[PDB]
Write a protein that binds this DNA or RNA. Structure first.
Lengths: 69, 398, 224, 136
RNA sequence: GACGGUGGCCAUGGAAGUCGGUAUCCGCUAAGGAGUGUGUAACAACUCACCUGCCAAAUGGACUAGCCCUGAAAAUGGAUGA
RNA sequence: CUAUGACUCUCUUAAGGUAGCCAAAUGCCUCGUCAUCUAAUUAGUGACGCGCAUGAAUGGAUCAAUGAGAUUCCCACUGUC
RNA sequence: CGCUCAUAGCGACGCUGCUUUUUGAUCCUUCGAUGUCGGCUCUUCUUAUCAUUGUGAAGCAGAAUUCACAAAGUGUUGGAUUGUUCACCCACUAACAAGGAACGUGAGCUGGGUUUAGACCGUCGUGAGACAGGUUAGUUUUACCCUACUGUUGUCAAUUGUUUGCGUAAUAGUAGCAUGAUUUAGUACGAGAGGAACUGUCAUGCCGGAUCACUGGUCUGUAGGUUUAUUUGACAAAAUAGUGACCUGCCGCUACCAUCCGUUGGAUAAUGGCUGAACGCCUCUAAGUCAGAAUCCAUUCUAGAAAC
């Protein structure tokens, strides 16, 4: 029903879908993708294959509304 | 030897055993619900077309069942259901070895379905041009008499009847210059009524809404996804040598044994795993979809409450490749037989089930229109995706 | 007076059921009879919610507070919250606690004027909790354990704790709380006392597994 | 064992933690490990392991731990799974982490439970819920 | 209808036909074991042997021995040859 | 009574198993008895030894290194799940 | 014996059978060569029925157990050790019943035993050597023929109309089974100890039929991202390394590594009754009839005939 956010990402988790991750830190993570969970595991804030919008956000190439987010 | 295990439960079922390439390209069943209904309101069958699957969050309807009002997701098979154009009435008469074709009657206004089964046919060809030689109804006044004669006779003489209907697949996304013909046996009331009203309906065009109500279970039919010939492994769900040191095969070991001193039917073997019939039952039906006159889209959202937007059930990008719903459709409960772009068929329940979690009301909440590395959700991925590109992007991929 | 109630034929009446000075919560269990009974007991007194907390049968061990505020973790949906709010009076604050680091109820025993916290809950979180109720929060365990509200049946009129509690801590717990702590158990020596009996000042609920003496003892404790 | 608790087999499922696999104690018993001999309930078939759940009550043994517990048969309850599963909600939960918690056949679990417990397990098992450090 | 001596003597101090041991007789009658069980504290109460009222011509039994049945269960689908 | 047999009688054939070793690549019975290792072990190892039928260049016992040799367990290994 | 009481449950001495799942006896068959033992795989069948369906006995109050009929419809497990069926333990389960099919199943596997050569011991042998003793290492060939099966065309190599469509439905197969928690109910029952069922609901185990909306899996999308080495003067952008590696990866297939779907009527067996004789009473039986199985046969589903 209701949307939420990924908590490793600026892009929302659409309604239903996705996968959680409860690490043993007593702190839940949600996840959109396998790509991003892998990224999380790696421990590099999504800036390493340049499709992903987080990279776009920070360096600000050809983005006005993604960069301000 | 005893066996000695116990289990070996017959890997498979012998109730689908001939497991060959099915007769009809369409969904087809040689069985119907019986007589205890009104009349033309109860047409029994219908024919749809598959167009993929989505998921829908709704609430449960069961007390003591992780809350009767708590949300759960479920999949759904959405299926473009164009309205059909009945055209022949056909009278079966009951006899010493079942029922037989006494004699049909056909409508005078239309005879293009006949034609449609013709261009794709013949090889010498004497009668393609436009004519016939398996006997069909022409003529205004002289054929009228014949029709009249037929109608009375069938009405008087024994046993129940069906209507030659067919789909309108030209107006569907997939192009086909032949359409799919079907019987929808008519139940209830009395034979006089039944025979009569078919004639009236020839010109008229039935709707899926005409057959089913939004909380009614289905007797669903189709023809299974045509994988093609493959061996005994995933044709029957057998086992293998998981640590692997064998010069034979993936294929199984004994096929009967020196037992009746020959090999039996009852042994899983190398054949094919696709176009088969079958029938799955008791499908809830969650939402009958409305027709779309190329203007509005609230009609294919459903509610505006809990839906809380205006969208078609079709995805953000939509269907450029696959069966695109522009018509009446059907949200069932998840999974139907047959691939994503197939000619299904529907019947109402043979035994119309009156149970709880079957007869009770269903009310949807969220119907989703998502996608991944490709598009997204409706207006949200439509905002951020378009600033980057000038022509390559138009949330279409077209 | 005290009544000996079951739930799913069990002794535990602080997992499915919650009961404080006011506001009773029960999760929609398969058995309706047991739901009805509570309602009957608390007729034109305390409204039962009949709402599965966090969409689940667990209630007493996933919620804290009494009748100034009422606590709920982040696991609960907005919808869930709303229903709860509707069920109870709209004088009390029912509010979701951000940044989940524990299952509340097992770590938040409380009274009308202070509260006993985990401790090990984060500072910000603690502050939020304090705000929601209005009452104070005091960082102290129960000897051996770290879960308080499970091993301390905390109300104004009396407080039950298992015998494993030490002498000094108990002495200073009592001082802190301004109500004495009494050594004792329920359900023939069950370690989890608070799940065994849920305590309201006017009527005290308990499992069926207690003996005749134990029940009497508990009655005497809570001034009934 | 009990058997009268609390409630059902608890709706949809996904097993995965099979026989053989060692999982964490997540408890103040002197054991660190719980090796699973077998799982209660799983009737099975030809060469299928009686696979454990996230609640499904389990026969165990402390492979490594306190040598007053070491060796013997043990029992417990499985508490988190290394592999994911879909829920009643239509949502997936995931730990790389995996663990049980030592218990008697009675239903009683000894003391406290360290780190996040499954919601399903809690629902099933009241004792677990009672001394739950965190429930997801 | 199925009694009197009679609650037979014993054990009991209740076992009074009938938890139960041993003797197991006589009266009177159409007939009635010092009693066939049910029941009861044991009795009482009921029933059985035993007799008679009515109805009204066959009845009862212990065996033999024809056919049949039971006994008589096992592995591809099956055998008076059909 | 010894565990065993130094011993004394006696017979066979000259003697009658010392050091050691052991259910051993040598133990029928035998899945020996005990301890251990395993949730569970006709397996492994360490003990016991009238040993069906061990034993001193027919070489006895030991053993570092060595080993495409033989076996057990643990750890890295999870499509040899 | 079972207190008492032969047959609730057992059953002496004793007696009659059946079986071919033990092993012998035999030597008909085969030495122009049926590949011997086990395990895996997979079906089939038998019932001498362990579970479940329905029934009846009990020393059956409840609980659990025991005994028996109908019935083989559906189940009949995970492991240590053993070459091993056999054996013996641990653990689950409603239960983990016995069997058969050339001691089912080697051009299906494996070769752990047994089966040659080499070789170690121990006992035996003057010795060459022996061992239903122990130990160790030891090439498992062939289907491109007929049949049988599986699916796939095609045909009455015209039955004496073409041509197709929409149909029928004989024949055959046939599928779902089993549990738990709760409701009943802490009720019935029981002095207490304890402690049910019909019925309702939510689930679960295995079985089957589909599907891919989610999640995961996979990647010649040689789709992007990264980087090793070499080559192309450099950047650039490419090539090779038989897809260079690595990350990510739609579409597509696919996972109890996910999702959905698995019906109702008659006919009975056992058995429990009715009315009611033979046998003035009696008796479920004889005439007759009622109720009644996970059973049978239909409905369902598959296929669709030298059948319409």
């Amino acid at each position: 029903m209701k949307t939420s956010l990924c908590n490793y990402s600026e892009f929302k988790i659409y309604p239903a879908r996705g996968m959680k991750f409860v690490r043993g830190d007593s702190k839940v993570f949600h996840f959109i993708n396998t790509k991003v969970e892998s990224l999380f595991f790696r421990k590099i804030n999504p800036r390493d294959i340049r499709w992903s919008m987080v990279y776009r956000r920070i360096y600000k190439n050809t983005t006005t509304d993604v960069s301000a987010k | 030897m005893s066996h000695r295990k116990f289990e070996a439960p017959r890997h498979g079922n012998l109730g689908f055993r001939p497991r060959k390439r099915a007769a009809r390209h369409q969904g087809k069943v040689k069985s119907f619900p019986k007589d205890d209904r009104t009349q033309k309101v109860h047409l029994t069958a219908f024919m749809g077309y598959k167009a993929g699957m989505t998921h829908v969050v709704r609430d449960l309807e069961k007390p003591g069942s992780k809350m009767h009002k708590k949300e759960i997701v479920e999949a759904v098979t959405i299926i473009e259901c164009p309205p059909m154009y009945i055209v022949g009435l056909v009278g079966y008469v009951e006899t010493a070895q079942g029922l037989k074709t006494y004699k049909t009657v056909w409508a005078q206004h239309l005879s293009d379905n006949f034609r449609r089964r013709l261009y794709k046919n013949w090889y010498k060809s004497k009668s393609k041009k436009a004519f016939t030689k398996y006997v069909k109804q022409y003529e205004t006044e002289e054929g009228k008499k014949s029709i009249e004669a037929s109608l009375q006779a069938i009405k008087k003489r024994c046993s129940v009847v069906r209507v030659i209907a067919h789909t309108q697949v030209h107006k569907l996304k997939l192009t086909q210059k032949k359409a799919h013909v079907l019987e929808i046996q008519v139940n209830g009331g009395s034979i006089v009524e039944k025979v009569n009203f078919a004639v009236a309906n020839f010109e008229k065009t039935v709707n899926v809404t005409g057959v089913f109500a939004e909380n009614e279970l289905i007797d669903v039919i189709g023809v299974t996804k045509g994988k093609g010939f493959n061996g005994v492994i995933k044709r029957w769900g057998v086992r293998k040598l998981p640590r692997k040191t064998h010069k034979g095969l993936r294929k199984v070991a004994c096929i009967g044994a020196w037992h009746p001193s020959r090999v039996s039917t009852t042994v899983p073997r190398a054949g094919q795993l696709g176009y088969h019939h079958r029938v799955e039952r008791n499908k809830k039906i969650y939402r009958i979809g409305q027709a779309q006159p190329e203007d509005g889209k609230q009609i294919s959202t459903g509610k505006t409450e809990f839906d809380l937007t205006e969208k078609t059930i079709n995805p953000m990008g939509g269907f450029a490749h696959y069966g695109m719903v522009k018509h009446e459709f059907l949200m069932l409960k998840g999974c139907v037989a047959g691939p994503r772009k197939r000619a299904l068929t529907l019947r109402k329940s043979i035994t119309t089930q009156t149970g709880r979690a079957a007869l009770e009301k269903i009310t949807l909440k969220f119907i989703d229109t998502s996608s991944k590395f490709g598009h997204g959700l409706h207006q949200t991925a439509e905002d951020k995706t378009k600033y980057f590109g000038v022509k390559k992007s138009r949330s279409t991929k077209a | 007076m005290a009544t000996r109630l079951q739930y799913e034929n069990s002794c535990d009446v602080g997992v499915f059921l919650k009961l404080t000075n006011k506001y009773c919560l029960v999760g929609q269990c398969g058995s309706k009879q047991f739901l009805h009974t509570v309602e009957n007991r608390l007729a034109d007194h305390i409204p039962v919610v009949e709402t599965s907390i966090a969409g689940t049968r667990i209630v007493g061990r996933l919620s804290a507070g009494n009748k100034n505020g009422l606590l709920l973790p982040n696991t609960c949906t907005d919808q869930e919250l709303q229903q709860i709010r509707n069920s109870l009076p709209d004088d009390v604050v029912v509010q979701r606690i951000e940044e989940k680091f524990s299952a509340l109820g097992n770590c938040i025993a409380t009274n009308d004027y202070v509260a006993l916290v985990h401790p090990d809950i984060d500072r910000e979180t603690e502050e939020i909790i304090a705000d929601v109720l209005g009452v104070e929060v005091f960082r102290q365990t129960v000897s051996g354990n770290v879960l308080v509200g499970t091993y301390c049946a905390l109300t104004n009129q009396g407080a039950l704790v298992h015998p494993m509690t030490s002498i000094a801590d108990q002495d200073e717990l009592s001082s802190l709380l301004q109500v004495p702590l009494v050594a004792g158990t329920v359900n023939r020596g069950n370690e989890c006392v608070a799940a065994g009996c849920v305590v309201n000042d006017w009527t005290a609920i308990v499992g069926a597994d207690t003996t005749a003496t134990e029940i009497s003892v508990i009655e005497s404790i809570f001034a009934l | 064992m009990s058997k009268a608790q609390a409630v059902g087999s608890n709706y949809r499922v996904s097993l995965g933690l099979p026989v053989g696999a060692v999982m964490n104690s997540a408890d103040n018993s002197g054991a660190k490990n719980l090796y699973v001999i077998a799982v209660k309930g799983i009737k099975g078939r030809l060469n299928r392991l009686p696979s454990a759940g996230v609640g499904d009550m389990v026969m165990a043994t402390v492979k490594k731990g306190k040598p007053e517990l070491r060796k013997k048969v043990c029992t417990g309850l499985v508490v988190r799974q290394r592999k994911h599963w879909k829920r009643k909600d239509g949502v997936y939960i995931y730990f790389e982490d995996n663990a049980g918690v030592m218990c008697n056949p009675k239903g009683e679990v000894k003391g406290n439970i360290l780190g996040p417990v499954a919601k399903e397990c809690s629902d099933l098992w009241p004792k677990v819920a009672t001394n739950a450090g965190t429930i997801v």
